[PDB]
Amino acid sequence: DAPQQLQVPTLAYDESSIVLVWKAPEDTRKIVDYQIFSAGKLLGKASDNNDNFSPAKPYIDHFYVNDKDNFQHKIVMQNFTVIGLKPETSYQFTVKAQYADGSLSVASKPITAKTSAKPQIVNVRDFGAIDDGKTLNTKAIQQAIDSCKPGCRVEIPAGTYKSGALWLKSDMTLNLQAGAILLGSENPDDYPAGYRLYPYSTIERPASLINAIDPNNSKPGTFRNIRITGSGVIDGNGWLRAKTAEITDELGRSLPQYVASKNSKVHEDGILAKNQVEKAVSDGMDLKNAYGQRRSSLMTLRGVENVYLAGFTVRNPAFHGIMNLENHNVVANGLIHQTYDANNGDGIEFGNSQNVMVFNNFFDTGDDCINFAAGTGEKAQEQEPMKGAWLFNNYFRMGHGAIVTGSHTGAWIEDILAENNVMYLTDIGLRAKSTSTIGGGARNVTFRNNAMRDLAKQVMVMTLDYADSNANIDYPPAKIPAQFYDFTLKNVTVDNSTGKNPSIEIKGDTANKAWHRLVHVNNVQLNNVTPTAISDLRDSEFNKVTFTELRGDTPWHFSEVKNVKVDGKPV
Ligand code: NI
Ligand code: NI
Ligand code: NI
Ligand code: NI
């Protein structure tokens, strides 16, 4: 059957290049690659193209190096980058599946796609931006952005440019060139009032280092067509290095290591984080809220329709890494996150956003790699559901969970597909969490065709707490309680999970009517992991789940279950 849904991701094109992605089927056992054709002429194979353009790809190939016996699910590439094109030119494209036996599928339905016109180019050095070792460049960089006409590319060339909060606008690209480091100011005054997370949030957070934030309005379409690209680094200047400041990773490359702090330690551990918490406490906040709310995140983009993030390295946030709040049509392509172990330094947060795509990312994060959020309590639905996410061809290294939905489930997290990824040293593959009074939940979540090694904690955890007016809770409680259902875990392999907690852990509170339902687990092999602990679950089935080298006596531990089934036989 022909590959489906060949497409250019939102804004993933410029004057000389176009990125293509397509769906891979559920069952890829026979598919070993994809070949891409332009006007029926072979441009190449997806595997080879990713070797060239994806920062995840060498890590992903390397993951299989010691996999004699073919234990690990072999992921396929679902993207191809076309370069060397001409400005304002249409190109037609098809894709074919390449099979084990060497034959090819029928072509996909073609697409035509057109490169853009060569953009006005604005260099920040022409506004007096300077890498001189302590000029603050905020004004220079903001002047360059302000001078932008629609379609402008703003360039930060090689060099380290210290900067305070910057404010982006519609219809522009900020390009961070090779050798460019955008460095956060450590001065809290360089980050003025930014935003409140939700409309009903009461504490104002500072601006991030990079912002698309309208002072009054969060609605999707407040901004449009924002692109941040290039192979340079955005460094938030949040934290000191850890005692072991740098490590050599599994490819022999160096990773930075950021101190893992807490609210009572930030005065010794923080840089911007320290200074911002100090300023907030002296302004009157207790230390807990100052730590929790008053550190600048690296990037906050709110109300943007069409966002393309590509190529850049993220380091050292004072708080979160990349935040998307109420955006539509977001693509993150080939970002490199090196933020281990900055406290709350998650890779990408998606908050009440729709139609989001992450591919070719490398994640080494201080918190969750990819987190989904949708508000809290009765007011949550003041906002869009968190709906439509497609996460593929990424390499997850360290982090609190590769795919996390969310704790904040109020308006619903839904229609999430994470396929053809590799995880190595990550805490957890799939994490789903909520409490009763948050409301909403998550549904239609598929985690499939992923391979995992040396997980630090557990494979998959779905947890639902009660309570009640037992609550020290800031939002109004939800009338309909939080639930999870319609979760699919298929064609997944894990070798080693070094935590002492349950490999597959599903937990609720059936007494208080809190259960999960409609969990479908098919064709999963778990080697050298602990037994499962599955609670509060109904109308679910586990088929062709094989445990080998079990760290315990029996894999299956069930309690408080209704209409569930292994494979194929009632529990
Ligand atoms: Ni090859
Ligand atoms: Ni640094
Ligand atoms: Ni961490
Ligand atoms: Ni956490």
Are 180 and 157 in contact by the 8 Å Cβ rule? The answer is yes
Number of the ligand closest to the Cα of 341: 3
SS3 state at 288:
helix
Query: Which residues on adjacent β-strands are paired with residue 152?
Result: 172
- Residue numbers annotated as active site: 367, 400
Whole-number Å distance between alpha carbons of 163 and 168 = 14
Domains 1-116 and 117-571 share a fold: no
Q: Pairing relation of β-strands 428-435 and 458-465?
A: parallel
Assigned CATH topology for domain 1-116: Immunoglobulin-like (2.60.40)
> H or E segment at 61?
helix 57-63
Nearest to 464 by CA among 444, 497, 442, 447: 442
Ligand 1 geometric centre to CA of 392 (Å):
19
Q: How far is the CA of 259 from the centre of ligand 2 (A)?
A: 11
108 secondary structure, DSSP code: P
Residue 500: count of CB within 10 angstroms of its CB: 9
| 3 state SS of 189 | helix
What is the b/e burial string over 12-51, where b = at least 16 CB atoms within 10 angstroms of the residue's CB? bbbeeebbbbbbbeeebeebbbbbbbbeeeebebbbebbe
Q: How far is the CA of 154 from the centre of ligand 3 (A)?
A: 33
CB 162 within 8 A of CB 139: no
Does residue 537 contact residue 507 with C-beta atoms inside 8 Å?
A: no
Ligand that lies nearest to the alpha carbon of residue 259, given by its number in the listed order: 3
Cα–Cα dist 526/528, whole Å: 7
Mark the breaks in the chain: residue after which each occurs, C to N over 2.5 Å: none
Report the C-alpha gap between 423 and 441 in whole angstroms: 25
Backbone φ and ψ for 59, nearest 5 degrees, come out as -65, -45
Q: Which CATH number fits domain 117-571: 3.30.1490.70, 2.160.20.10, 3.30.2290.10, 2.60.40.1120?
A: 2.160.20.10
Ligand 2 centre distance from Cα of residue 238 (Å): 9
**Domain ranges for the chain:** 1-116, 117-571
User: 266-286 burial by CB neighbour count: b if 16+ within 10 A, else e?
Assistant: beebbbbbbbbbbbbbeeebe
